[PDB]
């Protein structure tokens, strides 16, 4: 009986509907939601020109991952809020992906759709639906793309602010126009730390080119420096 | 089980011994009367023959049905889980106390007669709002104001502290207490202490959570919160961010203003409706009470008014000495220097400054916090 | 002296009680099972009688019979329609067309009729228990009390004068007044006062989701009322069900108009409700539709306002009937110290006076305590006060 996992499939007789055998691997709703998301798995070595932001995100969240006793010696509270802001999709999305990649955390980024709602709950009255999926997968992180968006984010922040008794839970919301965000979400205790994605320059585009063209079939001799010079810092 | 509730003696008097002897004699007489039934006409095991006969009589495969009406005389009307309405009767073990619409009634497999009831362990609305563990430490962790700590205690805990003091005075606890204060005033910190000290059930309600996207939904959510909290147990349910009733407009809800208005009317009805809600207390807080519906505040629905101001220059000292209790801060700086740094430094400001100083100390992996860390945290907190 | 002698003996008896009760069988906690000493009848005969004798006889809906013969028609909401017939244990006068009944599970013949389905949405909305609000506890509105009794109680109390007089009793009553002025405090009074069923239709309890899914609730409530002998349906917050029709441009705020129209139709005209008296209570009646307030449906238009000089005194005398206060208190001076306050405000003032007295050391309320409570409840909480924004009824 114990081996028979609740919310799992076991064989059932027909004339009797008596147990016949277990069912191995029927389904995981969180895995299905993630597959619907189709997250772009990345790698920390493929991060483009945001090294300091890389350590900041590491020092922001990952520190209480490979060393949970770091803040205990100093007696400081666990950081809660981290957001990605700046030019849209300037690599901030890629930086977030690489964060989980090098950190091994459960990535879940939502856009407030309705198809995924079929896996969180029947009605999804409150925003606690996602937490239930995360609540059993503690090694998880939360990412949210760029007015009800703040309302869901407002509830999440309030949820993971002392009311959520679970420790080692990370949520990161990414959007543009930080001066246009919700003033209620601008409370000093909500956003534990802030990181922006400034438009890369030529000094930054060189590594961006080295990463992007790495997978292409170039011609003997590249001379990408001049092209990057022709690139007047457009975006990531 | 509940054989005798008389414990008034609470001593070694002969009355307690006599009562115990009488109870023992009655139990022995009952046991002797019962034993002879099996000695003379056992006629069966009475331990497993009855259970086996019940299992073989009631349909072995019991389905998940749903009771929808009440028929006292060996009858019941329900709908088949496929959909076909049934006229299943009542069985011998019916114990017809859960005869309410919704509880699945299990019928037989041979004749589909009511076999068993459906134990319910869901309460979705209550679960999506039930506090499992204490949020924070005792009331001492709030710090500084305690003008409502006594007031809030009298409003909630004092009724639960020893409800004879208000009984001896000939009155019932205050209706409700609405905590309105400046942004980040610590209202949520007050609910933290309320929960860490609370004794009865507590429900947490996100302010926007009352406004749903489908027209008519919001009133249903309010009625469901009222049913869950009231029908569950004595409760202290805090609907935080009440200003979200009409302040914020979202395109998700089909209805316009006449939907937030309907939700507010339903909330008012659920607070002071046409029945006895029972022993239920409400403690709501808001940061912009200037727009809250006037009817939802008239004495009789929300009784106690509590205002939370920013931490005082004398209270700021306790706030700082509290939020930095376990920090290994170096004696290089004096907190009073930053105590007057901000002209209107609220309670959240002190916590933000402490967190920023800790983070800055962390970036260098140093063991203590220096004055420069606090100086650099102060600008990053207030100035942005 | 024998501290351990008695505790050990008591513990032994307590343990033996369970050790002997477990020998008959109360244990094995089930998930909805009755006591083995509660289903004893059905062991070999009763179960073989409660089970073998009867059949499920699934219930369905009838359409109509066909003349020239029994020629009844069987129809299933979710299974199928079919030409069927009743059983040998039914009468042919009761062949109601469109009647919920069960048919022989095998013979597919209706063997048992049934009462109409209850639609638990409007079945849960019955009082079934009058509130604890009595006439002596709602003082301050004696004229309104008499007016409401003449419509709900007096006409039904001695239905001999109205027949002799030769005039139809007044139809209903609408109580519109400033918020907190005592509307529900009297509706609970009406409920605990008479004996006829009172249906509480919370103004929000009628706005349904689907298009027209709400009006159907009005018809259900009206039928459940007319089914009984005499009913009095009290609807509160009547400002939500429907205010008026003002459609302009894109269709908005119209769905509530259909609900209000359905409520009116079941209330007036076309074989009206008859033995059902309406008792509504709006708090902002300014938006009430002209058709609903038009006499003949809600003829009485009683209004409940703030007690002027003696209403406050009566409220103090009533709401303070169980408060330990000094006998030398001058309540009338308090009633003169509250220029325009609501009755709920008076009850809250009595409460706050109790709390302040219990605050520091006292055991009985003091006149100065009530004075200080007035200074905060009325003079301190006056910022909103809920009165000024609704006094004009807008």
């Amino acid at each position: 009986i114990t081996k028979l996992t609740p919310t799992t499939r076991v064989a059932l007789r027909n004339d009797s509907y008596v147990l016949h055998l277990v069912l191995p691997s029927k389904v995981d709703p969180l895995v299905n939601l993630m597959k619907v998301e189709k997250v772009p798995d990345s790698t920390y070595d493929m991060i483009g020109g945001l090294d300091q932001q890389i350590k900041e995100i590491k020092e922001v969240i990952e520190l209480p991952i490979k060393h949970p006793e770091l803040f205990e010696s100093l007696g400081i509270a666990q950081p809660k809020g981290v957001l990605l802001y700046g030019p849209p999709g300037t690599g901030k999305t890629l930086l977030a992906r690489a964060v989980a990649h090098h950190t091994d955390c459960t990535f879940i980024r939502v856009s407030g759709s309705e198809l995924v709602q079929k896996y969180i709950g029947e009605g999804s009255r409150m925003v606690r639906e996602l937490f239930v999926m995360a609540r059993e997968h503690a090694p998880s992180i939360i990412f949210m793309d760029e007015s009800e968006v703040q309302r869901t984010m407002l509830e999440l922040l309030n949820q993971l602010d002392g009311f959520e008794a679970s420790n080692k839970i990370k949520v990161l919301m990414a959007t543009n126009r930080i001066d246009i965000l919700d003033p209620a979400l601008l409370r000093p205790g909500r956003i534990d730390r802030k990181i922006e994605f400034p438009n890369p320059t030529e000094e930054s585009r060189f590594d961006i080119l080295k990463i992007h063209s790495r997978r292409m079939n170039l011609m003997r001799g590249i001379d990408l420096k001049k092209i990057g010079d022709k690139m007047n810092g457009a975006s990531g | 089980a509940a054989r005798i509730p008389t414990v008034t003696p609470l001593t070694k008097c002969k009355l307690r011994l006599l009562k115990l002897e009488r109870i023992k004699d009655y139990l022995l007489m009952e046991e002797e009367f019962v034993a002879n039934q099996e000695r003379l006409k056992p006629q069966e095991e009475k331990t497993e023959e009855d259970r086996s006969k019940v299992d073989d009589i009631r349909g072995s495969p019991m389905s998940v049905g749903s009771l929808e009406e009440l028929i006292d005389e060996n009858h019941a009307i329900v709908s088949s889980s496929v959909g076909p309405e049934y006229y299943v009767s009542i069985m011998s073990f019916v114990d017809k106390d859960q005869l309410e619409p919704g509880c699945s009634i299990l019928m037989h497999n041979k004749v589909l007669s009511v076999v068993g009831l459906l134990q319910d362990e869901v309460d979705p609305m209550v679960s999506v709002m039930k506090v499992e563990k204490a949020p924070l430490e005792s009331y001492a962790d709030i710090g500084g104001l305690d003008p409502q700590i006594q007031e809030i205690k009298e409003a909630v805990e004092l009724p639960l502290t020893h409800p004879e003091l208000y009984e001896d005075i000939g009155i019932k606890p205050p209706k409700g207490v609405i905590l309105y204060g400046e942004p980040g005033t610590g209202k949520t910190l007050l609910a933290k202490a309320v929960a860490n000290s609370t004794s009865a059930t507590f429900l947490r309600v996100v302010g926007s959570e009352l406004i749903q996207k489908y027209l008519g939904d919001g009133p249903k959510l309010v009625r469901e919160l009222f049913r869950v909290a009231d029908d569950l147990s004595p409760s202290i349910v805090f609907i935080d961010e009440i200003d979200a009733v009409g302040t914020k407009r979202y395109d998700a809800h089909s209805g316009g203003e006449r939907e937030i208005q309907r939700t507010m009317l339903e909330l008012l009805n659920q607070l002071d409706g046409f029945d006895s809600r029972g022993d239920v207390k409400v403690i709501l807080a808001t940061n912009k009470i200037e727009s809250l519906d006037p009817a939802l505040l008239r004495p009789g629905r929300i009784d106690r008014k509590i205002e939370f101001p920013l931490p005082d220059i004398k209270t700021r000292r306790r706030i700082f000495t509290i939020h930095t209790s376990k920090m290994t801060l170096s004696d290089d700086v004096n907190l009073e220097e930053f105590v007057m740094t901000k002209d209107e430094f609220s309670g959240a400001d002190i916590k933000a400054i402490c967190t920023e100083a800790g983070l800055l100390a962390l970036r260098e992996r140093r063991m203590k916090v220096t004055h420069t860390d606090f100086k650099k945290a102060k600008e990053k907190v207030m100035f942005k | 002296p024998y501290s351990a002698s008695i505790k050990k003996v008591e513990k032994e008896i307590k343990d033996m009680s369970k050790k002997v009760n477990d020998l008959i069988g109360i244990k094995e906690s089930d998930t909805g099972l009755a006591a083995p000493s509660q289903w004893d009848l059905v062991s070999d005969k009763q179960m073989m009688q409660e089970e073998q004798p009867l059949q499920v006889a699934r219930c369905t809906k009838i359409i109509n019979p066909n003349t020239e013969d029994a020629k009844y028609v069987i129809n299933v909401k979710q299974i199928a329609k079919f030409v069927v017939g009743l059983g040998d244990k039914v009468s042919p006068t009761d062949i109601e067309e469109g009647m919920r009944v069960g048919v022989d599970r095998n013979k597919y013949q209706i063997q048992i009729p049934l009462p109409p389905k209850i639609d638990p949405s409007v079945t849960m909305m019955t009082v079934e228990e009058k509130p604890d609000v009595t006439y002596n506890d709602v003082g301050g509105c004696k004229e309104q009390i008499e007016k409401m009794r003449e419509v709900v109680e007096l006409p039904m109390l001695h239905p001999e004068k109205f027949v002799k007089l030769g005039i139809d009793p007044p139809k209903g009553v609408l109580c519109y007044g400033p918020p907190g002025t005592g509307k529900t405090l009297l509706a609970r009074a009406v409920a605990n006062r008479t004996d006829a069923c009172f249906i509480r239709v919370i103004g929000s309890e009628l706005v349904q989701k689907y298009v027209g899914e709400g009006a159907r609730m009005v018809r259900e409530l009206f039928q459940m009322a007319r089914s009984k002998k005499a009913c009095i349906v009290f609807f509160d917050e009547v400002d939500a069900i429907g205010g008026a029709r003002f459609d302009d441009g894109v269709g908005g705020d119209n769905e509530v108009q259909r609900t209000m129209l359905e409520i009116v139709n079941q209330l007036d005209g076309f074989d009206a409700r008859g033995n059902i008296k309406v008792l509504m209570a709006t708090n902002r009646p300014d938006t009430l539709d002209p058709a609903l307030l038009r006499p003949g449906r809600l003829d009485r238009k009683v209004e409940f306002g703030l007690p002027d000089l003696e209403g406050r005194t009566q409220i103090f005398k009533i709401h303070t009937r169980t408060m330990n206060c000094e006998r030398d208190i001058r309540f009338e001076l308090l009633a003169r110290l509250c220029p325009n306050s609501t009755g709920a405000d008076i009850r809250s003032v009595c409460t706050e006076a109790g709390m302040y007295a219990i605050r520091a050391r006292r055991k009985t309320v003091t006149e100065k305590d009530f004075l200080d409570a007035v200074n905060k409840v009325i003079k301190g909480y006056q910022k909103f006060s809920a009165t000024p924004k609704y006094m004009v009824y807008n």
Binding site: - | - | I63, N64, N66, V73, I79, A80, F82, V83, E97, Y108
Partner: protein, 54 residues
């Protein structure tokens, strides 16, 4: 000379022979009685509209 009818259970079945009443007796859109056992149309239900209109 053909018979076409659909059951009240989202099931459609036809009989090569009309039944008790010849096709002259019946017309399209009609609602009649058929055998649940033999799946044979026995008689014709005269008429019944929804009780709501009734």
């Amino acid at each position: 000379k053909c018979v076409v009818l659909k059951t009240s259970t989202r099931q459609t079945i036809f009989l090569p022979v009309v039944g008790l009443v010849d096709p002259d007796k019946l017309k399209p859109g009609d609602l009649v009685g058929v055998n649940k056992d033999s799946y044979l149309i026995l008689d014709t239900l005269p008429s019944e509209y929804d009780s709501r209109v009734k």
